[PDB]
Amino acid sequence: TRSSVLADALNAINNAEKTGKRQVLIRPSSKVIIKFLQVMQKHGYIGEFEYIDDHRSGKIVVQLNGRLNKCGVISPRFNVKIGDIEKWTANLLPARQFGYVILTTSAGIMDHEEARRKHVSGKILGFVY
């Protein structure tokens, strides 16, 4: 059954972007989905999005530019140390210049560059580029 809602969200976004659509509807709108999309937004990969408050769990309507090639999820949320960050980024990013591996740290959810700056590590959620 449904286990990771983030995975379904990013699969839907990926398929919309592959099909050329400029918007997509996410159900059922978790907090980690919100913060993930906020990271992608701060780096300029999706655009605006809107949380529809049904009284159950939420929906999200995301606007999409064409800047996104793959937003992905890493399940299980592996525990990641400060050099394993580099190992991962090598494995699952296209280049050393762009792309962001995203990891939930005790200092919030962030990208791996911000995690290197703050000098903290955590659990790996996914990636975007």
């Binding site: 399940s75 299980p76 949320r77 592996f78």
Partner: protein, 144 residues
């Protein structure tokens, strides 16, 4: 989900699954069952000394018409009987009988080599004199 479990607490499954599917291999199976030490007329050794009993004119496999000039060898440590091939033009005439030859494999990890059916070994020495050297006339065979 590609079959295999991905969960962060599912490592025991992966381990024991690997163990079984490793037994599905060939090299792992031969290494762990100990077939070399238990079978394989040597003892997993590179070479073995043996005593010649008989010379043989083994006929080649097809498509090939030839006779391959082998010998029967009783190994000293095991007592096992073994067929071995004497590689060169005319070198069977240095292996007369009751010689103490050194055998090696041919190179196929226990299989049979070419058009020669059933032989897995070759003669490297007779009385410690190196068939290659005897054939190139660098040394001569002892009297006895």
């Amino acid at each position: 989900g590609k079959g295999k479990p991905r969960g962060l607490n599912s490592a025991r499954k992966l381990r024991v699954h690997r163990r079984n599917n490793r037994w599905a291999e060939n090299n792992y199976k031969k290494r762990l069952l100990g077939t070399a030490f238990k079978s394989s007329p040597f003892g997993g050794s590179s070479h073995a000394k043996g005593i010649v009993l008989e010379k043989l004119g083994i006929e080649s496999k097809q498509p090939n018409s030839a006779i391959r000039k082998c010998v029967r060898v009783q190994l000293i440590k095991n007592g096992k009987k073994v067929t071995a091939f004497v590689p060169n033009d005319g070198c069977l005439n240095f292996v007369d009988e009751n010689d103490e030859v050194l055998l090696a494999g041919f190179g196929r990890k226990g299989k049979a080599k070419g058009d020669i059916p059933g032989v897995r070994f070759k003669v490297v020495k007779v009385s410690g004199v190196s068939l290659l050297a005897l054939w190139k006339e660098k040394k001569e065979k002892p009297r006895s």
